[PDB]
Design a protein around this ligand. Structure first.
Ligand SMILES: O=C1CCC/C=C/CCOC(=O)c2c(O)cc(O)c(Cl)c2C1
Length: 214
């Protein structure tokens, strides 16, 4: 598959740098940000399905699912929400600087809690606290499955998905964790963070665990 390359909006890049380099502690917050988005996307499919029940048939179950993958140092966060089409992947995750991107960078500088990122509607980028490379794998009812990829550089890429498993509907966040952030592949740590900061979530939050049989 041919891949297409795009430059990040100049302030989105700034922000990613202020994230990767400016904030230190409380990096566990990336999880609630990515669970929050998962819920906000599941909300939209559940709303749309009220007047278009057929929207749900491509994936009748509404859930949030986290999968630790120790071997490839990867943490994945899936939902069966509304999904994103190629154009939205492009617009919502790079080319267009969502209103508030610069505002949070300013807030942050004046002395703001990095945990307030979500209230500026930029929570997505908080993932770079624990990861240096990310794959966003989406499937909308109205397009094929695609892969959006950023390595924290200045650009990103979108490629028709012919390599990943078929998600019926929704999105997968394949975070490639930093060597010093691998505690998030642990069942207990994840399970902790989730209970402390994600109590009021309307959807099933499944944790996928792999254990050798003795
Ligand atoms: O804009 C996004 C943030 C959520 C608000 C809903 C947008 C419409 C679809 O959005 C998504 O599929 C989606 C998701 O499922 C999980 C995520 O972590 C992110 Cl970032 C997104 C993209």
């Amino acid at each position: 598959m041919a891949s297409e390359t795009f430059e990040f909006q100049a302030e989105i890049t700034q922000l990613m740098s202020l994230i990767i380099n400016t904030v230190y502690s409380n990096k566990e917050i990336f999880l609630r940000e990515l669970i929050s988005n998962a819920s906000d996307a599941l909300d939209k499919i559940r709303y749309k399905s009220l007047s278009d029940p057929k929207q749900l048939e491509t994936e009748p179950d509404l859930f949030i699912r986290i999968t630790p993958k120790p071997e490839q140092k990867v943490l994945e966060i899936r939902d069966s929400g509304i999904g994103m089409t190629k154009a939205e992947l492009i617009n919502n995750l790079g080319t267009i600087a969502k209103s508030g991107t610069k505002a949070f960078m300013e807030a942050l500088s004046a002395g703001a809690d990095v945990s307030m990122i979500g209230q500026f509607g930029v929570g997505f980028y908080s993932l770079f606290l624990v990861a240096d490379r990310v794959q966003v794998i989406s499937k909308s009812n109205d397009d094929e499955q695609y892969i959006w990829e950023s390595n924290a550089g200045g650009s990103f890429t979108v490629t028709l998905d012919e390599v990943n498993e078929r998600i019926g509907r929704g999105t997968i966040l394949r975070l490639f964790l930093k060597d010093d952030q691998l505690e998030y592949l642990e069942e207990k740590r994840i399970k902790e963070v989730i209970k402390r900061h994600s109590e009021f979530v309307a959807y099933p939050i499944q944790l996928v665990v792999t254990k050798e049989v003795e």
